[PDB]
Ligand binder design. Structure first.
Ligand SMILES: C[C@@H](c1cccc2c(-c3ccc(CS(C)(=O)=O)c(F)c3)c(C(=O)O)[nH]c12)n1cc(CNC(=N)N)nn1
Ligand SMILES: [Zn+2]
Ligand SMILES: [Zn+2]
Length: 232
C-alpha cells in the first residue's frame, strides 16, 4: 500500500512495480537460490510510447509475470531491455523477453560471461563500455561502466530526466550488513568503482540498489563501507 515492496508483500510468483519518478519505475520480484529467498530490483523507463527495461525479474516465470504487470499498470510495450551483468537476477528471463518481441542487449563482457556460465544470453552487444569511466546513451538513459565491483562486467544506469541512478548490484541498500553474493566480485577494486560513480553522478537524487530499498547518494558510501569490511 505505497511502501517499497519486500518479499512479504509480493504474492507467490508475482511482480510489483514502484513509481520512482515521472516515467521511471522499479520492478521487484523474489526468487529462491541455494535454499534462501531474496528480493531483487530492476528498472522501467518510459521511452515515448514505448518502454525500456533494465534487468529481468530473476527467472523465466518471474519475467513473464513482469511483462503482465507492466501491461496492467502501464500499458505501453516493452521494446528493448538491457541486462547490467551476467547473473541470473539480471539475465534469467531473457529468453522470455526475446519470445515476447523484446530486443535484448548487454555488453560483450556480460554476453561472454553469461555464455560461459550457462545463463541466458542477450542478443545484442553494447559497444563503447569496455573501459572504466565509459558512458553511452541508450534511449532515455545513460549506461556507465564504473569498473569491476560486484562483478567485472557490472553496468550502472542513469536517467538524466529524473536524476535517478540505478546502481544495480554494484550498489547495496542502507540496511545491508555484508556485501551480498561476492563470488564474482573484485572487493579491492569495488571502492574505486564506487568512487567513479560518485564523481560521475553527483546530482543523483534517487539511488536504486540491485537488491533492497532505494535511497539517496548515501547508498554509495555505505556500499564502499560494507565492501571494505567484508574484504577486511
Ligand atoms: C543470482 C545471484 C544471487 C543469488 C543469491 C543471492 C544474491 C545476492 C544477495 C545476497 C544477499 C543480500 C543481502 S546483504 C547485501 O545484506 O548481504 C543481497 F542484497 C543480495 C546478490 C547480490 O549481492 O547482487 N546476488 C545474488 N548470484 C549468482 C552468483 C554467482 N555465484 C557463484 N558461486 N559463482 N552471484 N550472484
Ligand atoms: Zn550479481
Ligand atoms: Zn544481484
Amino acid at each position: 500500500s505505497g511502501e517499497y515492496p519486500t518479499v512479504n508483500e509480493i504474492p507467490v510468483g508475482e511482480v510489483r512495480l514502484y513509481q520512482i519518478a515521472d516515467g521511471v519505475w522499479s520492478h521487484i520480484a523474489t526468487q529462491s537460490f541455494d535454499g534462501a529467498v531474496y528480493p531483487s530490483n530492476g528498472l522501467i523507463v518510459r521511452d515515448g510510447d514505448e518502454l525500456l527495461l533494465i534487468d529481468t525479474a530473476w527467472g523465466a516465470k518471474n519475467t513473464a509475470a513482469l511483462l503482465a504487470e507492466i501491461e496492467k499498470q502501464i500499458g505501453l510495450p516493452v521494446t528493448r531491455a538491457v541486462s547490467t551483468h551476467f547473473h541470473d537476477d539480471r539475465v534469467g528471463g531473457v529468453d522470455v523477453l526475446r519470445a515476447a518481441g523484446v530486443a535484448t542487449y548487454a555488453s560483450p563482457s556480460t554476453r561472454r560471461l553469461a555464455e560461459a556460465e550457462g545463463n541466458e544470453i542477450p542478443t545484442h552487444s553494447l559497444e563503447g563500455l569496455s573501459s572504466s569511466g565509459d558512458a553511452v546513451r541508450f534511449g532515455p538513459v545513460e549506461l556507465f561502466y564504473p569498473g569491476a565491483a560486484h562483478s567485472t562486467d557490472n553496468l550502472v544506469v542513469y536517467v538524466p530526466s529524473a536524476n535517478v541512478l540505478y546502481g544495480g548490484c554494484a550498489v547495496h541498500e542502507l540496511s545491508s550488513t555484508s556485501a551480498g553474493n561476492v563470488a564474482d566480485a573484485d572487493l579491492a577494486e569495488w571502492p574505486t568503482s564506487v568512487e567513479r560513480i560518485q564523481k560521475h553522478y553527483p546530482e543523483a537524487e534517487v539511488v536504486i540498489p540491485g537488491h533492497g530499498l532505494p535511497g539517496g547518494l548515501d547508498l554509495l558510501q555505505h556500499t564502499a563501507n560494507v565492501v571494505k569490511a567484508h574484504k577486511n
